[PDB]
Amino acid sequence: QLQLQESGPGLVKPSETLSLTCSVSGDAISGSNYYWGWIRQPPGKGLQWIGSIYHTGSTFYNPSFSSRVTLSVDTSKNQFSLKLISVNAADTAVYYCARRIRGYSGTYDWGQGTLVTVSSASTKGPSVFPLAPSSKSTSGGTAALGCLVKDYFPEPVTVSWNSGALTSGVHTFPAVLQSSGLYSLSSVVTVPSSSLGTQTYICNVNHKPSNTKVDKKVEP
Amino acid sequence: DIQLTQSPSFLSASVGDRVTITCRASQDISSYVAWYQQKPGNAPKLLISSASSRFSGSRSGTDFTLTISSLQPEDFATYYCQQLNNFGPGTTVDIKRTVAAPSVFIFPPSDEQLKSGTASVVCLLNNFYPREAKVQWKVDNALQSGNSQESVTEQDSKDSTYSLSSTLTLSKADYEKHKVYACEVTHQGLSSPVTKSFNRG
């Protein structure tokens, strides 16, 4: 199964260098007829091809980047890398590694993407507060409950409920930037009212930049 | 290199509609095109390539077309065309559905957060349509302004509704001033505004 896996820091200071690596599994870079590439997607925008590399080490770059981009390939480790120097806020984006077979009809295989934020602000882990179910959050035989994930930087956080067993009716809202410069979001879920006594509801919050892992039980 | 453009740029259509999206190249470099579907929070994924059943491709003049024969709720996504290392700007497809009134829930701040010196009050509007909604915070029957922030989910892939959080953020001191915290919701699906409230006590 082809998998393209991005790794690298999620926060880069302005004027510093953005570095990412793609680890390829399910196929070999060495001897292949593919272009191994990076494509980015800034917030609220479309897809921008950055550059590509052949297994020989030959590279091709988007002139938009003004020679700021270097690609390299490590055929021994079956990885290829992106280096973007002198970044600023316009370089904040989701970065995908990708591959395309050579020729006019070649299509792209994609990685899952990784957010890189360009900012001088420091990392900060979130506080997690319950949004407790109560009579004030019950409609019919349905109760709403959730978790408030407050004051973190940078994005993203991930929220699961009951280790992924609870997915129906989960709404994890897009983060909002507060005046303080920190992000905040809530994740909510609706459940049967009658279940609140027997079922324990836990929101699993992860904020990797701060190594924050929180399992918060949400009680009535 | 070339530029790819798409049309429409954005559209909203009902479940079961036939939807056609166009890709136009500034120069004719290739007879092959591919289309990608990007659902919210996901990487784009290859849909169809003219080089290889609801989805199909064709030619109109020099443009390339992508047709969805019967739009489904899970087709809510942005669609991109591609030739070599060139992408179109994307076409976002929203789902038009029947009006659905929100279910409204309100959450006082937690004791832990109150220990922290800040108070967040959260009002949830769940599973409504269309996206337009008015949430007004009233605190001891006085209307509030400038202390709330709203967040909206993307359209749900199964029922095509939105959910909405409005979060009122106060100092603990400002929270402790007043008694009744109320979220008043106006929406096309409701005859009259719905108010959910609680007493700080």
Numbering used by the authors:
A (entry chain H): 1 to 35, 35A, 35B, 36 to 82, 82A, 82B, 82C, 83 to 100, ...
B (entry chain L): 1 to 52, 60 to 91, 96 to 212
Which sentences did the original study use to describe this structure?
The HCMV Pentamer, composed of gH, gL, UL128, UL130, and UL131A, enhances entry into epithelial, endothelial, and myeloid cells by interacting with the cell surface receptor neuropilin 2 (NRP2). This elongated heteropentamer mediates tropism for endothelial and epithelial cells by binding to neuropilin 2 (NRP2) and triggering the viral fusion protein, gB, to facilitate entry into host cells. HCMV-directed antibodies isolated from asymptomatic donors predominantly target the Pentamer, suggesting that Pentamer-specific antibodies may restrict viral dissemination, making Pentamer a target for the development of vaccines and immunotherapeutics.
Model building was facilitated by high-resolution crystal structures of unbound Fabs (1-103: 1.9 Å, 1-32: 2.1 Å, 2-18: 2.8 Å, and 2-25: 2.5 Å), which were then used as reference restraints and lightly refined as a part of the complex. The heavy chain complementarity-determining region 3 (CDRH3) and light chain complementarity-determining region 1 (CDRL1) of Fab 1-103 compete with NRP2 for binding to the same portion of Pentamer that is engaged by the calcium-coordinating loop (residues 251 to 258) of NRP2 domain a2.
